[PDB]
Write a protein that binds this DNA or RNA. Structure first.
Ligand SMILES: [Mg+2]
Ligand SMILES: [Mg+2]
Lengths: 289, 108, 289, 108, 289, 289
DNA sequence: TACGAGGTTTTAGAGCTGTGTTGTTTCGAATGGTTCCAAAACCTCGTA
DNA sequence: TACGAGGTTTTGGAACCATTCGAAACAACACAGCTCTAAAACCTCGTA
DNA sequence: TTTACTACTCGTTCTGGTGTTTCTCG
DNA sequence: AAACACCAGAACGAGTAGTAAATTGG
């Protein structure tokens, strides 16, 4: 059937089938993966050339393949007519999520985000603003009716980029922030569709025109990662900040007491959040910068 | 009703024989009354379908047998619906289908 | 989102360039504008695709149907994000009332039974048509008496002989199986384009084959395939498939209009979805007359 | 019924801006689905008059504003009456209007 | 031998190139295909011609009408050789029987008188029309009683007042003079094209103004000019001439057909000549009805 | 009115009007001719540029202008609507030519032709053939019923160019003979239309497709002029014989006991022949080589 | 004899012409609509 | 007090679409022809 | 005054080749 | 794998210019 490995194709390559093996024929090096060890095949880049023979065999081995677009966002997935992957059942669970468990997990996630913002503000030696954000963290409630997240993200931005700063503006700092946030949103959406759950049903976000509500809800704690990189290179043009922003892929961060790459952190975080929402367990992930 | 006839051609110019054929074909087209709509595109005004049949017969008789040459016949009403994105319409009487033509004062 | 149905049978490579489906066989190179293509059907298991073409195909809501080694459909791409306000449509679908769902399912199953009765009537088989019409009246909300099954049984036994059954492995039964998975693909694509989900359907209390809503809406349209399979009962499978491919080129009378099957499917799906989610529309009528 | 739309253009190439305009216009024409009938002559297949109106609107939006560019819309029956003095008709499906298209075996 | 009537009013130079009438004014250069031109009319006495254009014009049987200083026609080119078998036609004309000539002249003068009567009838001047019709019956072979003159007298006195006469120098009389020398040119050209001669005519025993046959055949067609001059009796000479130029653009009902004046003139002349020379045709009928 | 000079324009020139003078503005030299001394203006070449002002004035001064085509043959003439040249009356006389006078003048002309052929044959030292042709000349009768002209012509041609020579052949001698005969025919037709008479009514020739019957009838005696030049350069290609044939324009011959250019001889001969046919006198011209 | 100079009619297609006509295309105007997105409009309330 | 951080609907327009329909147009076919040139007859009757 | 021929000479047209770059709310 | 920019670099398409020639039955 479907095994354990999730195979992500992010570079130019030709994928072919051979004697129950998937041939990852990348330009740099060629690899072969047995089709029984593959559970999800995620084709995130658009540089990939694949064969119909591979598609047929991956369907027969009950593997889920997910195609993403130029923006590295999930855009389609292959659905067999008869035999289905396990992740499909996840959709049913997403349709039945109790209000209280969503409340609790969203509150924990936004508490992590506020604590992360306070930690970074303290790191940039703005101890008074960090203490103010910490107090607003103590002001948190279920589903944040008092909008502590909004005032925290106002003190955060006015402290980092000056009181004249405003997200609606069209300066280079705002463009860099938007680009890094897009990077994180793409990562979290790709890891959400990998888990089989949808991005259009979120814990708190309910925007009609937003199709990544769950992705945003889960990526909220990770925004300070982008914010720190943007602030560290504030006095630069957008291209330099983008070149520095691409370092989040090849950097390491501390998660679960281990030094992990940020993509693995995002994947494991998403899986644990979905596990907590499924009511299988009540453990909520904790990411702190 | 008045017909209009658009001839479009691409002719090779590699050999001297091909250039001779192109020159002779252009001479024939101009002699038979084809107005240059654009480069390589010519138009002729025909009074009726009898004239169209006669003209296609003449063209087949004088076919250079080189390149890609095509003919499209459209009614004058259809030709008047042509949209000009840019450039200026050719206002010579040769394009017009007016029976009474004035060169100079039109007494009006 | 076009008119051309494109079927590929030969080993080749499919690529993308300037909104075109670049088909480059070793003999011929042939370009098709993406706006024209409506269904792409890859029967041969030797076609070499590229991921950018897949992204661009799902961008234009082009149905892509992959096929097995025996040239039968095995999977098809459905986009994660086909409607801008997809989140709102999914949220409204989750809140579908059971009463409205039952009423609309009763209406569409009555449409199916009535179309079967009319086809038997025009087939010069007058007697069984009256029995199906009588069975139609006995049908009630949610069909407690399984009158839909009785109508299908008499329909099949009258068209293909009393010995014929749906579960048999005879050739014309494989023809109906091929036809119904060609209609189901278009209906699934249209219900996804409507922003909804195929998993949650009107009947079976969300017990999903992942195509519950599409298979529920398809019910009045199955006589279209049944007629083509019936009148070619003598021919072999390849000829019946060739004749089945004529649903993409034949006009059918729907809502006082002579529309092609793609437009009828689209408009019917949209009207059913609008009748369900907002309760602000009338149930559509498709008649095989 | 199916419409056909013939665009004929002659564009200046003297200045680099003019060559920019020509290149961008050709890119746009190819992207919108225009088959090269001949050099400087392009054709597009439209399902109906609504598509023709939309396409002329798009062309006016993307008008290069250089040279002489004209459009003629003719019915598919009118386009089928075109006479080929020489050369070969383009037999690609893009020119044809068949709804059900087979690349390979047509099962017939 | 075409449809376009070309009128030149400005100082210019007329030349020939590739079957085209090259008109090169100091302002504009303008080319007309010789096959299209039917009548060429040079009113201005400043036009500079060339002999090659003259030869090519007479080759295509194009009427060329020169004009005086007052823009009135003064001369026109007629070709020596307009028909291949011109010698045979001239020899047959020389042998025209007096009986056939008298009969045909009686027929055409009856046509003229009848057209005058019909025009007075449609002019709402009922009474004089009956008198002309009565005068028509009194007409006999060669018109011994000069009934043609009596009909013309009542016609002119009824249309233009009793004081009006043909020999008067009033403006609308100059209008009729201009009109009648525009029909006479076409009729002379057509009788020359028929191979015949204008000198030898039906009446007056060959006492020729060099346009005897043309003036004889023209008789039924004078109401065409008389109508246009009559209904514009108020306007000045230039306006009446402008309206007279509409005979080249107006369709008239001839032999159950809506033909332009050039084709009617050609058909009438050919049929009259065939009825004369060979006695193997019926006299044509032109009706102003 | 019209004077005496006939002005022939045979070279490139621009003709303009000025203060009752015609301005022959030839390239070589410019001349001015008073409009009262001009009776006929013959524009024989196609290199001439003329003005409408000249045409108007020439019409007012009652001058006849005759346009000729590329082959230097009369193709058109300007006919005023009202005032006519004297030559027009000639047409009437041509219509009434008695049979006997035509018989006599044709017999004299063909006798001159036969005598000229015999004289030339004697000049080429073929005395026996010359005597045979002289005897056939004695065999002449009215209108040549015994066809002495044909047998004399065959003797002439078989003596000059060998017995194998035939007129229908496509050798260079035949082409040169045809070209020189065309030159003489053009001359005689131009001089016939100058006299006002038509070329389509001949003394003996009655060919329908021939439009220069009278021209041929008059030019018959002058054929030995072309024949001698062709025979003198028999052993040459056609271009050399044409270059030698052009010498007939700039040569001199004895006519009326004077050395005259051949064009003047042709003009005077034509005038005297028409005078003899008009029955004004009975003198017949005599041209002998 | 036969050919063939001087000729004349006969045909025989070749190319050309304009208008009616009858059924069948054709053209927009109309009739329902369909997504998609960017600009508003609203909430809470904490720091300037 | 205002701004705008965190957000959510609401609402025009913009661009797109497929089928109808009623009157007007149009397309070969069918007519009456027309002119024009070459290729055949036909003549008479000498000189091979 | 034209035609017919021959270059030459500019404009017009499209294809191949060579880099450079490829996530800008929530 | 695809778009977007830049160039070359051959193929088309006309216009101009200089030269030579311009009666092929009766
Ligand atoms: Mg071209
Ligand atoms: Mg062009």
């Amino acid at each position: 059937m479907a095994g354990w490995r999730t195979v992500v194709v992010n570079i130019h390559s030709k994928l072919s089938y051979k004697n129950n093996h998937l041939i990852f024929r990348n330009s740099y090096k060629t690899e072969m993966i047995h089709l029984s060890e593959i559970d999800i095949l995620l084709l995130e880049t658009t540089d990939i050339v694949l064969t119909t023979m591979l598609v047929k065999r991956l369907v027969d081995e009950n593997i889920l393949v997910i195609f993403c677009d130029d923006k590295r966002l999930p855009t389609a997935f292959l659905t067999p007519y008869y035999a289905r992957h396990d992740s499909s059942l996840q959709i049913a669970r997403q349709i039945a999520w109790k209000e209280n468990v969503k409340c609790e997990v969203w509150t924990a996630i936004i508490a992590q985000k506020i604590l992360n913002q306070s930690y970074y503000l303290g790191e940039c030696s703005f101890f008074e603003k960090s203490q103010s954000i910490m107090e607003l963290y103590h002001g948190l409630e279920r589903f944040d009716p008092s909008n502590r997240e909004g005032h925290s993200a106002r003190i955060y931005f006015n402290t980092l980029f000056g009181n004249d700063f405003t997200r609606e503006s069209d300066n280079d700092i705002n463009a860099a922030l938007d680009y890094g946030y897009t990077l994180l949103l793409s990562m979290f959406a790709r890891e959400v569709v990998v888990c089989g759950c949808m991005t259009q049903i979120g814990l708190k976000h309910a925007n009609q025109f937003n199709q990544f509500n769950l992705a945003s809800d889960i990526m909220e704690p990770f925004r300070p990662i982008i914010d720190r990189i943007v602030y560290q290179n504030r006095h630069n043009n957008f291209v330099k900040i983008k070149k520095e922003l691409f370092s989040i892929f090849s950097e390491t961060y501390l998660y679960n007491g281990k030094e992990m790459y940020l993509s693995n952190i995002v994947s494991d975080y998403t899986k644990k959040v979905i596990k907590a929402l499924n009511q299988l367990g009540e453990e909520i992930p904790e990411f702190r910068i | 009703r008045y017909m209009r006839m658009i001839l479009m051609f691409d002719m090779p110019t590699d050999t001297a024989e091909e250039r001779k054929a192109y020159r002779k074909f252009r001479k024939f087209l101009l002699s038979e009354g084809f107005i240059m709509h654009q480069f390589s595109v010519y138009s002729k005004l025909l009074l009726n379908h009898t004239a169209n049949t006669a003209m296609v017969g003449r063209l087949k008789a004088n076919n250079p047998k080189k390149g890609n040459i095509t003919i499209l016949t459209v009614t004058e009403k259809q030709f008047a619906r042509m949209i000009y994105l840019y450039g200026d319409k050719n206002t010579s009487i040769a394009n017009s289908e007016e029976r009474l033509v004035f060169l100079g004062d039109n007494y009006c």
